[PDB]
Amino acid sequence: HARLRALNGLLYKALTDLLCTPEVSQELYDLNVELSKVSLTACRA
Amino acid sequence: TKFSIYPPIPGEESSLRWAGKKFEEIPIAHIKASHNNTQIQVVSASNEPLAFASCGTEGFRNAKKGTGIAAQTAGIAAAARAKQKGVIHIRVVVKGLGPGRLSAMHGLIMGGLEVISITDNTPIPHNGCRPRKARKL
């Protein structure tokens, strides 16, 4: 449970890092999307 | 060209212009977003008031002033009044963390004004006065 919580936090951090960097995609970098929540069961963002 | 989020430095000649005006000359839209109210005032680069608006001035009263829609209406009214005086581009200077902190900007956008820079001037005391005690609720 706590391990799954930490996994959700790590997934949230990784997705945020991918969003912030421009190397992933110019479109995604220009969007500047921000994530409210990330939860793994499949993963819901 | 490469866009830099950093504002152009006063005293240094930049290529950026708006309506033939420099960043140092663009009028300034001060926004104060309290928890119970939101106030908007446009001034010239020479600190000349051109338009003022607030939730209370727009007819909203008491708790209704705290809604974001009230701040949006205040932004619309302030933008209309400023545009009546020739204001086109503005530099937004927002302070406070009220619900309308963003909504007011939207109102200005809905009012016809163009926001070229967003500045936060929230008064953050570097260990200044002592705030009131926490609410026992």
Partner: protein
């Protein structure tokens, strides 16, 4: 009793400690250019050691020098000096987009 027995000595393969980038260098309060490298460009907040990657001694020296420069009219407090916005980026922080 035999030559093949191991001998006692310090680890010869021990790679040197990764010194902080300012280690061995004199941090000064008048060096506003160096001090500004460790403050937030938008708020002037001094970065923590987990962002600057500095050793404790150098982090404390940088903090004290920054405070002294700010109180002595050498360095802006609420923002990084714009003249140094293009200096080498040593802090491990990413802001935009």
């Amino acid at each position: 009793s035999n030559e093949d027995l191991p001998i006692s000595m310090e680890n010869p393969y021990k790679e040197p400690l990764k010194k902080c980038i300012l280690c061995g260098k004199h941090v000064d309060y008048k060096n506003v250019q160096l001090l500004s490298q460790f403050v937030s460009p938008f708020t002037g907040c001094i970065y923590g050691r987990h962002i600057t990657g500095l050793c404790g001694k150098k982090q404390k020296e940088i903090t004290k020098a920054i405070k002294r420069a700010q109180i002595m009219g050498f360095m802006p407090v609420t923002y990084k000096d714009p003249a140094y916005l293009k200096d080498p980026k040593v802090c491990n922080i990413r802001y935009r987009e």
